């Protein structure tokens, strides 16, 4: 047997059927948060190339939106280049302490200059050099190059301009899934999916 | 990244990308990464819509690594009509990923049997009673059918459906921290006569 998870993980929403999935979200984070889950935010992210193959990568979840979850990347990327050709998207988030899983599914939106400005400025100024520098998933062709010039930027030890590539996605969700490991191994799938006024909410079998 | 977490192949760029990852698995195993194998696996639909969850790398084969599910399943139906996937795995506590690609395969049923037994036999019963990923529409009645299978001594038969597929790889990515964020990217790409290797920028 594979799971470790030895921590409470409350789930009376399998129970309850909440009609808006975006509170059953902030209430397991809100828990991860105050038990210390490590690293919560960390979500495997699966975009689909032009023929639908399927390619993953972690990345933060920087914000809870009204509509989703918000991740920042460069523009240039492989997630990035697939998802300005086709916007449907997919993540998990695994909780190895509580046995829980959050998948998230919906299409991600490139939102304004503006807003990639800020989240910019936001980050640490000691990861601006390297990340003006690279040029994301591209071949790196000459590792100590890429180190002496990103050292020469570093010497300012404060804010550069934000890169033209840097961008903020808001990943718009269309269902979710909350699970949880359950009693007798009857795994808890509370399942929801959009509807054209809310959400239909239904359980799926382990 | 709070264990050690050692990258040589970075620097000496080693010809065989199965042989990487089996010595980053093993390595994994001694230190005492928890869960490493549990693989967050994206599947996509006929109009190119992913999906994901986390399944168990159950073994690693001369082609690529090995899990099972059930057919009928939502990742099954995918792949019945999509082969191909990604997979991530990523490891907290040395700050490193590993990153799948490739054309997932339903191995034969032989091969299915001997994957069904080699399971805790605790698992037999709620695995042959749910049809994974169709609706729920009667949680107790599971669970009471369930019940009654668990009362059996040994093995159950291997329920239809349950299967094992081989995710064949074409491509690899390992991931490292690396220092000053110059984060340590090594691409693999498979060949005609073997395997391309090459940096990626972070
Ligand atoms: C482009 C980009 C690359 C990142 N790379 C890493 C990384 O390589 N390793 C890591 O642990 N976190 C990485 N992060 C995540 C940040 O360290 C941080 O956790 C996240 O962006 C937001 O942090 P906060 O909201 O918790 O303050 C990256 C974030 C971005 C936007
Ligand atoms: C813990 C962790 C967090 C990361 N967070 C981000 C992130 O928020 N944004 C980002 O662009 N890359 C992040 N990265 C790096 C990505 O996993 C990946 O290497 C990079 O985005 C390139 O992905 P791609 O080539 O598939 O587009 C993170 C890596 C780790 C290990
Ligand atoms: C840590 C962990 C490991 C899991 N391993 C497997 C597995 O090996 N095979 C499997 O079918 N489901 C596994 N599951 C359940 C899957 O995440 C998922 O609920 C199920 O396979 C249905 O996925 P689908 O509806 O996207 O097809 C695991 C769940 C967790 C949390």
């Known amino acids: 047997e594979s799971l470790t998870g030895t921590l409470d993980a409350p789930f009376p929403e399998y ?26 935010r960390a979500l495997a992210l699966a975009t689909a190339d032009s023929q639908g193959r399927p390619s993953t990568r972690i990345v933060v979840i920087s914000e809870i939106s ?40 919906g299409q991600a939106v490139r939102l304004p200059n503006a807003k990639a400005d800020d989240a910019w400025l936001k980050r640490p100024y000691a990861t601006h050099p390297m990340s003006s520098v690279s040029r994301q998933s591209e071949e790196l062709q000459d590792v100590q190059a890429m180190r002496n010039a990103a050292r020469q930027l570093a010497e300012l030890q404060g804010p550069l301009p934000r890169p033209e590539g840097y961008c903020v996605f808001e990943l718009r969700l269309e269902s979710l ?17 959009r509807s054209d006024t809310g ?3 239904r359980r799926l079998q382990p």
Do not use: C
């Open 15 to 40: 129970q309850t059927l909440p009609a808006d999935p975006m509170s059953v979200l902030h209430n397991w984070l809100e828990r991860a948060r105050r038990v210390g889950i490590r690293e919560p």
């Open 177 to 193: 899934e909350f699970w949880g490991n359950g009693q007798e191994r009857l795994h808890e799938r509370l399942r929801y999916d």
């Open 199 to 201: 959400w239909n909410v």
């Open 66 to 105: 009204d509509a989703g979850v918000v991740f920042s990347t460069h523009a240039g990327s492989q997630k990035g280049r697939e998802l300005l050709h086709n916007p449907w998207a997919s993540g998990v988030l695994y909780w190895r302490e509580t046995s829980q899983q959050i998948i998230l599914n």
